[PDB]
Amino acid sequence: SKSLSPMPQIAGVTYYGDIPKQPKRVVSLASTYTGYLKKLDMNLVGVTSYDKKNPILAKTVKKAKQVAATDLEAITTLKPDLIVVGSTEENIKQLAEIAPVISIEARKRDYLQVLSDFGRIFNKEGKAKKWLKDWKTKTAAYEKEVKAVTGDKATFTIMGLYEKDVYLFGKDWGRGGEIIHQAFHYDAPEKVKTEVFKQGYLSLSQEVLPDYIGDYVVIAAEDDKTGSALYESKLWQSIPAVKKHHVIKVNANVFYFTDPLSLEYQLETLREAILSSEN
């Protein structure tokens, strides 16, 4: 009974059932995509725990219920007309019995393409295009502002802390890499480009961190406690970027994401942080 999406064939996108063109009750089970759906003015009736913990996105989905993919009863009761999932979810068959499902395989389309792809799926091309045009202009302008401070050839490394572990990231695995590397066009150290960029992420022992940091480091964490021991260590304090105050500590609860809402916050935050590194 619903008007249907044209359901274009797009790398990484799989449809289960007849996708509505204008869904009225969307359940997002993939925090990667929730904010894209919000930017295109979808009514989100269910979202993930990560979405509720994203302090930027959460403000826009207060009426949505938090659900997990296993919550077949709760999701059914929300009466969705569309469910959105990542391709690694394991009960897509059961979910597709409740409502049509869009399943997206991460990384097959870039962080901007995902928005225009949803524009095609939902016939919201104008909303997507206007956002993307503004993003292109704004990021080019901000690139000039930040490189006026650092110089054009400064190297950046994207890092994240989780529990006792340290990770490096490339240009397309969140933690600010899309903005730093794709939008501001900052280079990375050679070792990061060689060892990290293709896979997208790399687990590292803390003792080798100096070898992967050049001019600046952006470090994501979910709380202030996680990095405290690292930051106080002689190892960390010996790194030139640390001595120069070129460490930018960011809130992973928003910086994991690449949706438009999260990105807008991240962009202003990173611009201001680079300016502030010379206080």
Helix (H) or strand (E) holding 101: strand 101-104
**Are 189 and 248 contacting, i.e. CB atoms less than 8 angstroms apart?**
no
Rg of the chain on CA atoms, in Å: 20
Binding piece for Cl ion, criterion CB under 5 A, among 96-104, 166-174, 194-202, 245-253: 245-253
Does 28 contact Cl ion by CB under 5 A? no
Binding piece for Zn ion, criterion CB under 5 A, among 71-79, 91-99, 160-168, 191-199: 91-99
Does 185 contact Zn ion by CB under 5 A? yes
Question: Of the candidates 250, 252, 261, 270, which one interacts with Cl ion according to CB under 5 A?
Answer: 250
Distance CA 262, CA 279 (A): 26
Least distance between Na ion and beta carbon 153 (Å)? 20
| 185 labeled binding residue | yes
Least distance between Cl ion and beta carbon 82 (Å)? 31
Least Cα distance to 86 among 41, 23, 34, 9 occurs for: 34
Q: What residue 205 binds from Zn ion, Na ion, Cl ion, none (CB within 5 to 8 A, per partner kind)? A: none
| 143 labeled binding residue | yes
The Cα angle at residue 227 between residues 166 and 153, in degrees rounded to 5: 65
Least distance between Cl ion and beta carbon 108 (Å)? 28
- 228 backbone dihedrals φ, ψ, rounded to 5°: -60, -45
Helix (H) or strand (E) holding 271: helix 260-276
Q: Please say which residue, 217 or 250, places its beta carbon nearer to Cl ion.
A: 250
Sign of the CA dihedral 44, 269, 135, 111?
Answer: negative
| 181 labeled binding residue | no
Binding residues for Zn(2+): 18, 73, 90, 97, 143, 165, 185, 222, 232, 245-246, 278
Binding residues: 18, 73, 90, 97, 143, 165, 185, 222, 232, 245-246, 278
